[PDB]
Amino acid sequence: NMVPLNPNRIIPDETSLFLESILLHQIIGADLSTIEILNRLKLDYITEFKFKNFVIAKGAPIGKSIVSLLLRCKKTLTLDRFIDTLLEDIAVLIKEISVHPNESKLAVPFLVALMYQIVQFRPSATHNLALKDCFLFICDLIRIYHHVLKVPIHESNMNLHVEPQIFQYELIDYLIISYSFDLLEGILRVLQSHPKQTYMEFFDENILKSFEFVYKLALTISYKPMVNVIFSAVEVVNIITSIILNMDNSSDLKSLISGSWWRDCITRLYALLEKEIKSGDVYNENVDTTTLHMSKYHDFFGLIRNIGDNELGGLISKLIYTDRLQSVPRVISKEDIGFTAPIIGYKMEKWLLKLKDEVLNIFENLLMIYGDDATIVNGEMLIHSSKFLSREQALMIERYVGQDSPNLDLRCHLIEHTLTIIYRLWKDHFKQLREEQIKQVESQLIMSLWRFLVCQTETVTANEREMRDHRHLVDSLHDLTIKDQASYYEDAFEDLPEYIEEELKMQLNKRTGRIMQVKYDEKFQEMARTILESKSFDLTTLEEADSLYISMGL
Amino acid sequence: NMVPLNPNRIIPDETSLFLESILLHQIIGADLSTIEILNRLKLDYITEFKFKNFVIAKGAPIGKSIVSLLLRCKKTLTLDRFIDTLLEDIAVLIKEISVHPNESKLAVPFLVALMYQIVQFRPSATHNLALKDCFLFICDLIRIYHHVLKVPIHESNMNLHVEPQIFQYELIDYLIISYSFDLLEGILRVLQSHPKQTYMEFFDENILKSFEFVYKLALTISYKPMVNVIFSAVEVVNIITSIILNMDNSSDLKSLISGSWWRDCITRLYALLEKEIKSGDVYNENVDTTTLHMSKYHDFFGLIRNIGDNELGGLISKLIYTDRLQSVPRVISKEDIGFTAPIIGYKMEKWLLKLKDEVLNIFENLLMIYGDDATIVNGEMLIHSSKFLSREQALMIERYVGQDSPNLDLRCHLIEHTLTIIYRLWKDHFKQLREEQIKQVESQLIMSLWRFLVCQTETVTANEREMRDHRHLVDSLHDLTIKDQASYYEDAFEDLPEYIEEELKMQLNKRTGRIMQVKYDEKFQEMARTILESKSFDLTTLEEADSLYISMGL
């Protein structure tokens, strides 16, 4: 029962493959190799630099200067060692490219992507200090590039849009800001994946409700919060939750934040969630502070979310002449980038519904973080979560049902989860709610409850024969799902083992009859029941209750 | 007494090593890195070029096309496989880059720098099929440049040297031809260093005919000789000798070779060897077919032999702009290249000494090759070897000793070895000598013999004083090196353990006495004695020998 050794071992070294992988690397969307893009870069208006046996001549091959340093330090350093060394070098490089008046920043955004790749390739048993060094350096690069996110609510009467239309420098700084935020994101993601003992080693002064303005400049209330950076800062908030929920003395780690900063966070989280989702113009600009509508003048993946069209990347290729060592990028029409099929739009709408998912997940994570009471907690925020549930019940029943479009699946599973959200506050959390809050809104909550209190008719389908018609009427998109997914996807979708086709003819009921806000699982009705029919507060006394009961039949 | 395992090395993969080494190589002399030199290459007058998933656009990055092919085929092939794949691709490349009317060949030589770095890199189990593919391809490449090594015997009264004065395409084709013959050298010696099993499978009469074309082209008897190609070609002859002395039944390869071709080689060896060494104008042009003058036109190392000033090295760098993808080389002056210190001239005296070492060394080798006789076996070896012995005896004593320059040490070790050559003749090959030959030159052989028969006085040393005086007279330069060596560059040249201070004194005694033309080895004189004082031929009966005996004393 012994097991022997493997004699075949020809192990490709970590650094060799790393080095090459970066050399030829290709980003999603463009044409040309990463380092090789780099080989057509020259840093002119700064005629020289030197930091650490790292000369660059005036008209030097930045590229061959990059790969130069890389390869040369190759036979010097080791995996993690070469990592932190290049991080510091290219970081200093960023700073050099940063503080200069006439300098163009073309190179900068390519280097940020390079660093992401690096830390993403092999983030093993490293140490945070390097991460923090880059991290702070780039947050305050962002305070160097703070001249972006807090541009106004909108135009003036005359903040003219007559323009050089240089998406070039727009995409420049958008890549910059995004990519950089995305740094924040990812290097934190590996702070989000270091040995859990070092969650406290990720502590930073900028992370303590500061980082220049960071989150403030991001989720503006007087400017345009932009879906990318929106994602970013809110993700950082998620990072805070993350550090909250992983090490036993979470109490210590939580102590860092300033109370006002908790507030400045969760408040603008509310301000996020009480915006809206309308595929009508998700891809044009409209009423502000309300429409997470990702204008075209930026639309690509982002460095870790393969979101959609990436109607940019090919223009990343376009950026360089790919044949001449150059400093300023190639022109792009701000408008040529982007009625064929709103299906790409509908898939990113399912991704905006995934964003509402993560927003509710962050609110549930905030609930988890709050073991006791908080100053940031409004108290009636539980009723405000039920207010969100009530809108996506009324307007659910009234609009998005009957529209043969897969957005329904999450537009329902969302509030199916908000059930868990509220059901958490069934009783265990009923010791802070000022009566002020519960009766400032007596109207909405009972509606939230009575939604399943009237759903508990529990007597609609009991079979298929009627309701296969229900499905046929609009669920045809879910039929596209069933047909493509069973056609050539998975293995539990082909050869149905004589019980999952029965699960078809029933689960299909329980999902397609589950479109129009009707017939929710015995948990749903009983989770709401164990909350309402318990008289822990005077919502439901019979002298004002059988009007509901008689409304149920009874 | 076991020794434990040591597998915990972080082993650099052989393929990865090869890759990175090529990727950053810089050659001996220039300023720039191989692959990036490559990165400054465009192949223009061939607007498309393509052989095997190896597209290159018109103005495309040659160099990036390399690194592309390199890296892609990396995660394809193993070591040897990556070799042969390159070899085929680059071979097709070179072939067409050759066969083209308006094409300039800039890339070709630099790719030939590739050729070297590559094929040299690991010749361990490489197969002769690939070797010969490259090989023939380059020999007939050479016959595509056969328009070089047979340029006339001298500049005619009408032939002008008014010029575009470019050293460019001269150095271009010079590198080409040389580097190519240098291929011939390197790959053929990887043949000789392959296992003896993989030998005859490569040798066909095609080798004889193709190399016969090139040799005839090269060691001209009716044009300008050209020292580098002179080198290369003759060592290929040495390669023939090598396969002879190595194949246990070398009769196979010998029968392969043609009698006319042995003749057209050994005869041109005679043409080479009866030239002369004159450091007076080793660096200008004089009586031809007699002086191996390595002019600046082709003066660098050569892809092995680090001969000296290598004065072309950095001018290799100056060939590319090292800033822009380009097709035709950057200009160089034909004359700026190249009274300060003729110590370089004397480095070369030592080297051309190593060359005449090669002359006598190959002639020795063929000597031992033909234990049985042959057709080119003719005795003119006896004639001319003894002849060279005579001339470097007489002119030795009248000119070269006493000139306080360490050339004489090797200049004499030469003929001290030719002693072994002739003594080999005496032991073995005295069953062919023609009366024709012995009485065409009764003169020079007896001269040679009596040169040490008059030396055999054996009556010099008797003390230290006179010989140390001789030393102070002549051995000045030899002691410059002796003291550089004892004071700079040796473990043994400190802490003499009291049994070698006498070694110092008497060894310097013997070396200085052996410096001044006199009292050569007891082995020398008795081995020569066993030839003359033995009466195997009627050179020396007493009736006509005692006049020399009395002319020695006796």
From Swiss-Prot, chains A, B:
Q: Is Cytoplasm given among the entry's keywords?
A: yes
Tell me the keywords, alphabetical order: Chromatin regulator, Coiled coil, Cytoplasm, DNA damage, DNA repair, Nucleus, Phosphoprotein
Q: At the top level of its lineage, which domain of life is listed?
A: Eukaryota
Q: Which GO terms describe its biological process?
A: chromatin organization; DNA damage checkpoint signaling; DNA repair; establishment of protein localization; nucleobase-containing compound metabolic process; regulation of double-strand break repair; telomere maintenance via telomerase
- Report the leader peptide range: none
Question: Post-translation: what modifications?
Answer: Phosphorylated by MEC1 in a cell cycle dependent manner and in response to DNA damage.
What is the additional note? Present with 606 molecules/cell in log phase SD medium.
Q: What does this protein do?
A: Forms a complex with the serine/threonine kinase MEC1 which activates checkpoint signaling upon genotoxic stresses. The MEC1-LCD1 complex is recruited by the single-strand-binding protein complex RPA to DNA lesions in order to initiate the DNA repair by homologous recombination, after the MRX-complex and TEL1 are displaced. Required for the recruitment of MEC1 to DNA lesions, the activation of CHK1 and RAD53 kinases and phosphorylation of RAD9 in response to DNA damage. Required for cell growth and meiotic recombination.
Question: Assembly and interactions?
Answer: Forms a complex with MEC1.
Put simply, this protein is called DNA damage checkpoint protein LCD1
> What lineage does UniProt assign to this protein's organism?
Eukaryota, Fungi, Dikarya, Ascomycota, Saccharomycotina
Gene behind this protein: LCD1
- Boundaries of the shown chain within the full protein: 189 to 747 of 747
